[PDB]
Amino acid sequence: GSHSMRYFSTSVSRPGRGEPRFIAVGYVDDTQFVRFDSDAASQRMEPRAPWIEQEGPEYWDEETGKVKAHSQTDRENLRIALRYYNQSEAGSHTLQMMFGCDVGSDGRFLRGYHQYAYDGKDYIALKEDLRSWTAADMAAQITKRKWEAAHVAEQQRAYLEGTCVDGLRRYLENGKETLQRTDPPKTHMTHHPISDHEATLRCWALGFYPAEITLTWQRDGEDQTQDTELVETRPAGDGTFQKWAAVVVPSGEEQRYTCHVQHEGLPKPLTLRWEP
Amino acid sequence: MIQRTPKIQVYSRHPAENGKSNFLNCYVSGFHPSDIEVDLLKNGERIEKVEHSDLSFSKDWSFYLLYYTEFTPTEKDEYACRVNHVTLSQPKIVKWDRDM
Amino acid sequence: YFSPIRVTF
Ligand SMILES: [Mg+2]
Ligand SMILES: [Mg+2]
């Protein structure tokens, strides 16, 4: 299958209470594998998945250097954004950066990403061709013109199609035993009377990886969205995910309803009915 | 400025069975800005040893965190999570229901 | 591998 690597970095200014906090986390697919937190004790990039631990001391030295330098750069970008938006030194602001790359089953480059958001809104993003920028407002167009003049897109493309995919391919190899897995959902259905006239059927999906999944209710084989509830997919805390979907049905009509489960770990989609 | 109110889910790592060790989770997601206060409660008392995940965010830039602690469910013990965020007027308490 | 590119706004 295809795979993704992403780093998610957050800078939060806090006037009066020190320099901005900077935290960065790295993921392959839905599995976190590194972190750096400027407020934590170690001041190093730290492992958060077993398969990254076999990286040598030079890895941790170089990754720490990059993420510490980037924290300083985004401290400066927080100051620049204040100037561009005519904001005071009093308030707290957020600067988020995401970047990474996708590879196919043969390990070849598919896509790259590099984008920034300021106070929760898009600021600037590298477009899909890795050759031009989307600027979200007039302030970001200053940055876009600057980055065009300095050919930053070409620098980004060199990383995203090179060292980015080199890393993703390496991590997939070192983390072979766990990152290639598809844990299918373990499914079951519960039944709860809620009145003399209605009952809730709840269809559970537990223990699955990756997180992508679909749960849908049908009645008499037709899609049913009214009188349903569906929670957002949530981490179990052990590297797998959970979801459920519920429907409120007339008492005695339970057998008209089916829950449909699609997940890559499943040989075929499931059609589940209340048992009894 | 753009602010987003946290979503909150409180649930167990495995289907709860009385007398069997488990993990109690509070997943907060979809919020902005990033500061958030999350407590896990047992019978109304703050649980002390609670760990949480490293701050991360989704494609739409909203943040998420998982808070978790070990627990062994009983019939009588009540659990909850308590969340505060600048978008909230007062703390939000969500009770744990082993069926949800 | 973290990005090596550090540029200002
Ligand atoms: Mg543009
Ligand atoms: Mg492994």
Author numbering:
A (entry chain A): 1 to 276
B (entry chain B): 0 to 99
C (entry chain C): 1 to 9
List passages from the publication reporting this PDB structure.
HLA-A*24:02 allele, highly prevalent in Indigenous populations, is associated with influenza-induced mortality, although the basis for this association is unclear. Here, we define CD8+ T-cell immune landscapes against IAV and IBV, restricted by the mortality-associated HLA-A24 allomorph. We identify immunodominant protective CD8+ T-cell epitopes, one towards IAV and six towards IBV, with A24/PB2550–558-specific CD8+ T cells being cross-reactive between IAV and IBV. Consistent with the HLA-A24 peptide-binding motif generated by NetMHC4.037,38 motif viewer, enrichment of Tyr/Phe at P2 and Phe/Leu/Ile at P9 were observed.
